Design a protein around this nucleic acid. Structure first.
Ligand SMILES: [Mg+2]
Ligand SMILES: [Zn+2]
Ligand SMILES: [Zn+2]
Ligand SMILES: [Zn+2]
Ligand SMILES: [Zn+2]
Lengths: 558, 171, 269, 107, 97, 112, 149, 85, 84, 178
RNA sequence: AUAUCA
């Protein structure tokens, strides 16, 4: 199992999205992360106080997880940080950063328009956090001067002074990960003709953002607590723990590291390099050359599929699996590990029809029944029966696979020396085989219907196919040309009730799709039904008696 | 000081206790958990008031487990000390460093240095005492202290205090 | 896309269809507050036929020797002739039936009679007939008041919305409108006696059953009507093979709110 | 209301919100040749009073957010001269219930 | 087998709330973390044995809860964090409506 | 009228194939596209750009570009959508989970 | 691992991989439940995916015996790529780069084995013999084309 | 370490089953260890869903001379229920 | 806020979902050796026990019916009509 | 699991300011003047002078002993022994804090009888002084209006020297003659 | 990654 914690169990009621304040990234962190080395204390078999577990997460079936201990199947893994040499853009915002610069003064950090402009006070009024930022921008982008005095809220003759600074605002454009401005200028009233062309440094953008008023940035999307605009530009880098980027130690000359561990090491190496350059005699242009390398590695780590930029590739020619790309597609973490996931107590095989099964039942192959299990609680009502299936064991049909004690530890009836002399106690759980009349979820994929997943009664049968009643064919959209179907087993009394009480086959007969029956008589039975019911059709006594007896609820009246 | 505070505690009752002596066991477990307790937020939770009217409310059954969880809303007498609070207490311990004073549930310690200069340590006494020109402070003596500051320490709150200023000291 | 757009839609305990924002999508599920499984195509008689054919079917005139209910129809037949007080009630009855006819002709402009509605009234009558071994010879033990008022009363018990206030009460009236036109058409005095030949107990039973069935017929708060609707359009789209863009590629145009559509056309009447 | 043949200069249009609490509306004569409200597909919209609105929201336990919205520029919202915040009660025929009442708040 | 997106939908259509929870939790992913009550993060150094709690940086050795979420979400959350985004998890509400 | 035309159109696509879908289903879709005040499409642009929860929107099509924006706008997901509780592995607030269940000690002590 | 209940010195335990459990063969107590497929897990590091479509492929295998632990990607052309930024970011890797270049003497051994028709196991021994003796003071100043020979 | 729960008895001391022995699920056809230090188990078991009799077993070296061994397993599949035609 | 019993306006009838959940919950509790409020007339399956308890309205549970605003109406299983 | 209050405030991400607790009448968030009882009603802070407190606890444990025997059906040095007996009956016994508290309270209470604590409570709660001062005035025996204003510094300009000195006189007069 | 299955 997973051991007990005195902590109160609660449910998640709200999720508060935001950006990481570098102060916080530093504060959470449990390790510095100084070296691009994985482990190998120079040709050794232990992690290096530098990258993965410098003080961090734990792996390799070993507890050591900084006092926390626990090890793998309990430790969530805790974060490290990396201190970046110079600020870099977070690839995802790069544009929100650009837009914020476009809205504010690149010298004083004040909104280019305010309460004095009518269109502004109107857009400022917008309740929607995103729509107001959207409107504020289309207005402020155009404004290329920080105004000192603006016409009063009555007369355009006597101009009232707002905030100071007269400075000209650059025309910002992106040059992939870089933001470069083009200042309008003045020179003999004309100029530009040929303006001031300079790239805006992370550090300068950071400083303006630091000076943006709480009231101002709050008028823009931003929140003073959870997401200040200064927190978009990366200064400190949260380093994810091994769980997020697993390693594998094959055979002493084979070892596999995750693409992130590679990408991190490049960030680090590029960092260590640029740190040495700034410390030493800064050659200006050899530094900004090393900065836009760091910028690339950090950027390409969160996103490798960047438009305009070259991909970071991994020796074999394949591009590095960035973080973005793990979340993204179907088969991503969202579409494929959360919104849908493979499951245990599942079973699949070829389906075949049966005129002798009842509408709501499902023929389950003995082998499938002998694998799938229901955890039943030992109770005065079942105690004797359960003890017998336990005695029967994992190989006999109505048998069991495991016994779950109060203590939490699982007894494997297949190997336990005490699998014979096993004496049950009320409250224990017997993980017993799936048995005739258990409710089970039966499903035929695609599943574009609620009727594509229905609850059936088990009927353990021989032969390797799932047998279904022919009239239930239509809702699933199944045939027996080589179709396979899925079976899911509920594990709780609650879950079972859900199946039997809401989604059982008989309930599903009249469907709301078209307010009519979604199952009817088909094929042989449809063909035979016409033939039987003609005026011409007469049956002799002998056959009438068999035909009558065949009806399972027949009154006994000829 | 010494407050009456309205408080609530979530209790998780196992199904086996879903008998008629349920409220009785809840009210009991409440008292076991809350009474005696010392928190930073509330101080010493000393005595739960109005036993006969402790609001149990309806307990929500926790889904995968059997157990029900209730938010037992109650009201109790608390003692939360503060810096600047002038308190009266009895000396308990006394050493070359100062003396501890018992103020209800908590101990407030007075440094040799947080007392006037005239009061000096006398080791040569049973029990060890502090001696002024006029006064004698020892294990049984009653003192009026000014709390200089508190430290929220686990299952207690301890504090440092002076008897140097005016209207403080022996009583 | 249909599923992802609708997922969070469901019927709340106020019969309101809302999303994860509590924003009202539909005020009442599918404008009638009924579960789709509990609905069946039924014929609204009143709707069609000649104005004369309607008259023969529905009109009772106790003040005319030819248009009264024959004493063969009910026991009170002889004593009922010329009852001015009773005739006031049959006038209300007929006047409502005429009101209903105009109204239904406004809703279904083509005059289409067959519509999916809850409670198969046709079947309840059929059952009353075998259940009570209805003798298509002997006269009924019903009063005109028994029929007329009985129906009037049953109607007040066909509950979809429960709140005690004009908004919610007017809302209830609204949801129940169409079903009642059907109910009034199938349970008008002349019809009940001449056609159905119901006894008082048979009628009393028919009424209770319409009520019970109707109530069972309402949607259950919790119904995830969002996903239901998505899948109820999704599944059929999966089975899809003037000349205008139709089928799968048109549904694609529709869902996308496609600006530059393939076959734009006006139908000028 | 100002019914104009072809256009109203942006000079003149700037005088529209110049005299409050009074309100000005501009209608292009060409739109009005046909009353859209008379169309098969156009149901009865009814403007609610401040008290009627207050009641709607009270009766359905609503915030103005939660109500379906008629756009300010909507042909019918124009015809009725609806203002932001104002609510309409739409009464449509139903193949389901015969009569269905929906509500729309102004944008 | 994969209890995929389209299967989630059918369960949502049926109204099988608890059957779905089971498929996604008990029958697969399900994991337990300790979160902080101040900054709704998975920061908590649960030394659940010595019964020590701590969320240093918050200096919170008191306001701590435990939650049952699918490990893939514990993962997703750690991933969003590594990417400088904070998915703060709170056990109470503050908005109403 | 936009709603009435939009339904008419949807209805035709189904009935052209000789299929029947009950009104309510098409009505709901038609209504959802409508409610906002215009023609909100069943696309990454339309519905997925509304005020619903961020994890919900992220489960369809725009995923990461939705979660970055969710971060810088400091969004708060109230977790009422089915998507959220599924991601979180909690009992969704749908049918069976649309209400709460309590034991009453009053009624409990009454039956014995 | 050793069963907490039994404890016999040769701890007889089985890995019931199919049920994903680690059992004590004597008492039957399950000693672990989380159990991972190492074959398929190793498929995520060394795959056949060179294109880049596999979502399972998420890491790469390295050789800690021969090149130590030098994790390093390479700036290269992708689908949407300007040939300008590739040059700059590569000209920027030039200033950050002696012994990290003497690894091209492995390219001297590899091109010598392939010219001598030598197997893949010989190159990797010649590369390990050269890495552990090219910086020795015992070899000092021997003919650098005769110490790899 | 980490031995397969399957049986190793059918292996001759060269680590192979002799051809002719009947096998079954989870049983060990080829015994292999990857010494690292004493040594982990790198053996090949027969697919758990199958069974049969070993047909032929051959031992060889390749282009560079790595010892490698191929094992053939023969079964006779008699038409059952879900069998397609 | 909790709606008073005299001001409750939700259905007097139990929803399919409610009934499925009550039966699920009781069966679960019965199965976890909770006290049974009915004569088991030889019954052993906790769902068939649950069905029996609900059949005689001897289930001590209450449905907290939440309204979109957050308020609620509490309804006893004893008081809910079971026409399902 | 620990105890919560009626103070619901949502500290979202924004950790601190936790501004110091002093008798500048700046007590905690928890010991604020505007409190809220379980019935939602805004109710003022309840501060007790050790005597008002002694009586409260005694009352509660006395009433508890009642229910404990009901549910079981089917001179100061003298007060110390009497109380130490009631604690053995109602309290958990492990709760040593209440034992010391009750002893301290018995030995330091200025007013013995409930009647006495009544008048104290009247006389004082008419000054408009904040519950903290009103308690410290009841629990600290002062003679000079300066003794009071020095020990309870918060009082400073809140009351006249003479008005406070008039109270201090009618407080001394109420002290139960131990 | 190709081939394939309904
Ligand atoms: Mg097929
Ligand atoms: Zn740890
Ligand atoms: Zn400026
Ligand atoms: Zn924290
Ligand atoms: Zn053992």
């Amino acid at each position: 199992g997973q051991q007990y914690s005195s902590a109160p169990l609660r449910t998640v009621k709200e999720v508060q999205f935001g950006l990481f304040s570098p102060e916080e990234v530093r504060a959470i962190s449990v390790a510095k992360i100084r070296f691009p080395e994985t482990m190998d204390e120079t040709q050794t078999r232990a992690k290096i106080g530098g990258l993965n577990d410098p003080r961090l997460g734990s792996i390799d079936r070993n507890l050591k997880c900084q006092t926390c201990q626990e090890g793998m199947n309990e430790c969530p893994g805790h974060f490290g940080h990396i201190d970046l040499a110079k600020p870099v853009f977070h690839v995802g915002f790069i544009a929100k950063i650009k837009k914020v610069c476009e809205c504010v003064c690149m010298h004083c950090g004040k909104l280019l328009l305010d309460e004095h402009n009518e269109l502004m006070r109107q857009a400022l009024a917008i309740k929607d956090s995103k729509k107001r930022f959207a409107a504020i921008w289309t207005l402020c982008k155009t404004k290329m001067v920080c105004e000192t005095d603006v016409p009063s809220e009555d007369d355009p003759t006597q101009l009232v002074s707002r905030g100071g600074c007269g400075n000209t605002q650059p025309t910002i454009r992106k040059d992939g990960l870089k933001l470069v401005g083009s200042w309008k200028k003045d020179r003999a009233t004309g100029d530009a003709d040929e303006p001031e062309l300079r790239v805006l440094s992370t550090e300068e953008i950071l400083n303006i953002f630091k000076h943006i008023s709480v009231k101002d940035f709050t008028s823009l999307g931003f929140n003073e607590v959870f997401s200040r605009p200064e927190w978009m530009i990366l200064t400190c880098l949260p380093v994810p723990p091994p769980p997020v980027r697993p390693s594998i130690s094959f055979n002493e000359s084979q070892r596999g590291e995750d693409d992130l561990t590679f990408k991190l090491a490049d960030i680090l190496k590029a960092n260590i390099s640029l740190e040495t350059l700034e410390h030493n005699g800064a050659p200006h242009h050899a530094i900004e050359e090393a900065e836009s390398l760091l910028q690339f590695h950090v950027a390409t780590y969160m996103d490798n599929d960047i438009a305009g930029q070259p991909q970071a590739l991994q020796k074999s020619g394949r591009p590095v699996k960035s973080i973005r790309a793990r979340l993204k597609g179907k088969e991503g973490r969202i579409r494929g590990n959360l919104m849908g996931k493979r499951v245990d107590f599942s079973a699949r095989t070829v389906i075949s029809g049966d005129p002798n099964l009842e509408l709501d039942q499902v023929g389950v192959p003995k082998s499938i029944a002998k694998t799938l299990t229901y955890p039943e609680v030992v109770t005065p009502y079942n105690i004797d029966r359960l003890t017998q299936l336990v005695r029967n064991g994992p190989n006999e049909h109505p048998g069991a696979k495991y016994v779950i004690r109060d203590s939490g530890d699982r007894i494997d009836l297949r190997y336990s020396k005490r699998a014979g002399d096993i004496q049950l106690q009320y409250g224990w759980k017997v993980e017993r085989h799936i048995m005739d009349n258990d409710p089970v979820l039966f499903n035929r994929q695609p599943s574009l219907h609620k009727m594509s997943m229905m609850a059936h009664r088990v009927k353990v049968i021989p032969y390797s196919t799932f047998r279904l009643n022919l009239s239930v064919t239509s809702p699933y959209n199944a045939d027996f040309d080589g179709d396979e179907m899925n079976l899911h087993v509920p594990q709780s009394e609650e879950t079972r009730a859900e199946l039997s009480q809401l989604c059982a086959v008989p309930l599903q007969i009249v469907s709301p799709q078209s307010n009519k029956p979604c199952m009817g008589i088909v094929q042989d039975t449809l063909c035979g039904i016409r033939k039987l019911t003609l005026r011409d059709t007469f049956i002799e006594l002998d056959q009438v008696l068999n035909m009558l007896y065949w009806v399972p609820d027949w009154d006994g009246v000829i | 000081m010494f407050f009456i505070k309205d408080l609530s505690l979530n209790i998780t009752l196992h199904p086996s206790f879903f008998g008629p002596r349920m409220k009785q066991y809840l009210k009991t477990k409440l008292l076991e958990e809350v009474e005696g307790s010392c928190t930073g937020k509330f101080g010493y939770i000393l005595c739960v008031l109005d036993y006969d009217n402790i609001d149990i409310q309806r307990g929500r059954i926790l889904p995968t487990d059997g157990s029900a969880e209730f938010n037992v809303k109650y009201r109790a007498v608390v003692f939360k000390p503060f810096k600047g609070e002038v308190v009266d207490g009895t000396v308990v311990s006394c050493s070359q460093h100062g003396f501890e004073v018992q103020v209800g549930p908590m101990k407030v310690f007075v440094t040799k240095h947080l007392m006037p200069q005239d009061l000096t340590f006398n080791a040569g006494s049973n029990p060890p005492s502090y001696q002024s020109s006029e006064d004698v402070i020892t294990i049984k003596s009653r003192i009026r202290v000014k709390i200089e500051g508190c430290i929220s320490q686990v299952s207690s709150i301890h504090a440092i205090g002076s008897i140097k200023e005016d209207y403080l000291g022996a009583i | 896309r249909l599923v992802k757009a609708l997922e969070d839609i469901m019927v709340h305990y106020d019969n309101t269809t809302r999303n994860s924002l509590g924003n009202v999508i539909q005020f009442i599920y599918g404008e009638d507050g009924m579960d789709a499984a509990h609905i069946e195509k039924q014929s609204l008689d009143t709707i069609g036929g000649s104005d004369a054919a309607f008259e023969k079917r529905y009109r009772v005139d106790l003040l005319n020797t030819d248009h009264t209910l024959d004493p063969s129809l009910l026991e009170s037949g002889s004593e009922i002739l010329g009852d001015l007080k009773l005739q006031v009630l049959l006038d209300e009855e007929y006047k409502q039936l005429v009101k209903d006819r105009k109204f239904l002709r406004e809703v279904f402009v083509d005059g289409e009679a067959n519509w999916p509605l809850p409670v198969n009234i046709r079947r309840i009558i059929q059952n009353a007939q075998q259940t009570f071994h209805i003798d298509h010879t002997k006269p009924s033990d019903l009063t005109i008041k028994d029929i007329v008022l009985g129906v009037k009363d049953l109607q007040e018990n066909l509950l979809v919305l429960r709140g005690k206030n004009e908004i919610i009460q007017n809302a209830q009236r609204d949801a129940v409108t169409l079903f009642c036109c059907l109910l009034r058409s199938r349970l008008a005095t002349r019809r009940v006696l001449q056609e159905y030949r119901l006894t008082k107990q048979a009628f009393d039973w028919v009424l209770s059953n319409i009520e019970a069935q109707f109530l069972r017929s309402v949607v259950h708060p919790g119904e995830m009507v969002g996903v239901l609707a998505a899948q109820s359009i999704g599944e059929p789209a999966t089975q899809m093979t003037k000349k205008v863009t139709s089928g799968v590629p048109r549904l694609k145009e529709i869902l996308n709110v496609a600006k530059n559509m393939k076959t734009p056309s006006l139908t000028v009447y | 209301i100002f019914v104009y043949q072809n256009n109203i200069t942006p000079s003149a249009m700037k005088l529209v919100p110049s005299i409050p609490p009074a309100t000005i509306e501009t209608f292009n004569e060409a739109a009005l040749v046909v009353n859209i409200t008379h169309h098969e597909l156009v149901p009865k919209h009814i403007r609610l009073s401040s008290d009627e609105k207050r009641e709607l929201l009270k009766r359905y336990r609503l915030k103005e957010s939660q109500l379906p919205r008629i756009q300010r520029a909507d042909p019918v919202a124009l015809y009725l001269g609806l203002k932001r915040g104002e609510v309409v009660k739409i009464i449509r025929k139903s193949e389901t219930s015969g009569r269905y009442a929906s509500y729309r708040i102004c944008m | 087998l994969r209890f995929g997106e389209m299967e989630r939908d059918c369960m949502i259509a049926h109204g099988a709330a608890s059957f779905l929870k089971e498929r996604l939790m008990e029958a697969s992913d399900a994991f337990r973390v300790h979160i902080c009550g101040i900054c709704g993060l998975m920061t908590v150094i649960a030394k659940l044995n010595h019964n020590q709690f701590e969320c240093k940086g918050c200096d919170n050795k008191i306001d701590i809860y435990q939650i049952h979420i699918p490990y893939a979400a514990k993962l997703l959350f750690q991933e969003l964090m590594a990417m400088n985004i904070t998915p703060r998890l709170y056990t109470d509400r503050s908005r109403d409506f | 009228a936009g709603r009435a035309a939009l339904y008419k159109e949807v209805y035709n696509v189904i009935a052209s194939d000789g299929s029947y879908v009950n009104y309510r289903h098409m009505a709901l879709l038609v209504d959802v596209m409508t409610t906002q005040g215009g023609l909100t499409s069943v696309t990454r642009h339309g519905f997925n750009r509304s005020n619903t929860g961020a994890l919900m929107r992220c489960s369809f099509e725009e995923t990461v570009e939705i979660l970055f924006e969710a971060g810088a706008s400091a969004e708060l997901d109230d977790c009422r959508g089915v998507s959220e509780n599924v991601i979180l592995g909690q009992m969704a607030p749908i049918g069976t989970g649309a209400f709460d269940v309590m034991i009453d000690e009053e009624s409990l002590v009454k039956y014995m | 691992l050793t069963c907490p209940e039994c404890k016999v010195y040769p701890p007889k335990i089985v890995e019931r991989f199919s049920e994903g459990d680690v059992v004590c063969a004597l008492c039957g107590l399950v000693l672990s439940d989380k159990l991972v497929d190492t074959r398929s897990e190793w498929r995520t590091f060394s795959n056949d995916d060179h294109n880049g479509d596999d979502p399972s492929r998420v890491g790469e295998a390295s050789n800690p015996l021969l090149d130590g632990n030098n994790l390093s990607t390479r700036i290269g052309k992708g689908e949407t790529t300007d040939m300008r930024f590739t040059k700059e970011l590569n000209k920027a890797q030039g200033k950050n780069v002696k012994d990290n270049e003497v690894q091209a003497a492995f390219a001297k051994i590899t091109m010598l084995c392939d010219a001598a028709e030598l197997p893949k196991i010989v190159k990797d021994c010649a590369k390990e013999a050269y890495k552990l003796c090219h910086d020795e003071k015992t070899l000092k100043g021997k003919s650098m084309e005769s110490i790899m020979a | 370490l980490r031995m397969k729960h399957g049986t190793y008895d059918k292996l001759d001391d060269d680590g192979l089953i002799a051809p002719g022995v009947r096998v079954s699920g989870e049983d060990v056809i080829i015994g292999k260890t990857t010494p690292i230090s004493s040594k982990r188990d790198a053996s090949t078991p027969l697919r758990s869903t199958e069974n049969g009799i070993v047909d032929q077993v051959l031992v060889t070296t390749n282009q560079d001379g790595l010892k490698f061994v191929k094992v053939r397993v023969r079964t006779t599949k008699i038409p059952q229920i879900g069998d397609k035609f | 806020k909790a709606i008073p019993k005299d001001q409750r306006a939700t259905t007097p009838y139990m929803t399919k979902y409610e009934r499925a959940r009550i039966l699920g919950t009781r069966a679960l509790q019965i199965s976890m050796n909770a006290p049974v409020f009915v004569d088991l007339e030889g019954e052993t399956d906790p769902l068939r026990i649950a069905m029996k308890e609900l059949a005689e309205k001897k289930i001590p549970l209450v449905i907290r019916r939440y309204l979109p605003d957050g308020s609620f109406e509490d309804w006893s299983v004893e008081e809910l009509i079971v026409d399902l | 699991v620990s105890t919560s209050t009626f103070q619901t405030r949502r500290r979202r991400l924004k950790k601190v300011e936790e501004e110091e607790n002093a008798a500048t009448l700046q007590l905690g968030q928890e010991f604020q003047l505007k409190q809220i009882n379980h019935q939602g009603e805004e109710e003022e802070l309840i501060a007790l002078n050790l005597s008002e407190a002694r009586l409260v606890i005694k009352e509660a444990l006395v009433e508890r002993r009642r229910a404990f025997k009901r549910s079981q059906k089917k001179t100061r040095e003298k007060e110390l022994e009497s109380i130490d007996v009631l604690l053995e009956q109602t309290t958990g016994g492990n709760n040593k804090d209440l034992k010391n508290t009750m002893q301290y309270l018995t030995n330091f209470s200025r007013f013995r009888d409930q009647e006495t604590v009544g008048a104290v409570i009247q006389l004082l709660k008419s000054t408009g002084l904040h519950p903290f001062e009103v308690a410290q005035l009841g629990s600290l025996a002062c003679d000079t209006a300066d003794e009071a204003k020095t020990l309870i510094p918060s009082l400073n300009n809140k009351i006249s020297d003479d008005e406070l000195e008039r109270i201090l006189k009618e407080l001394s007069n109420l002290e139960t003659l131990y």
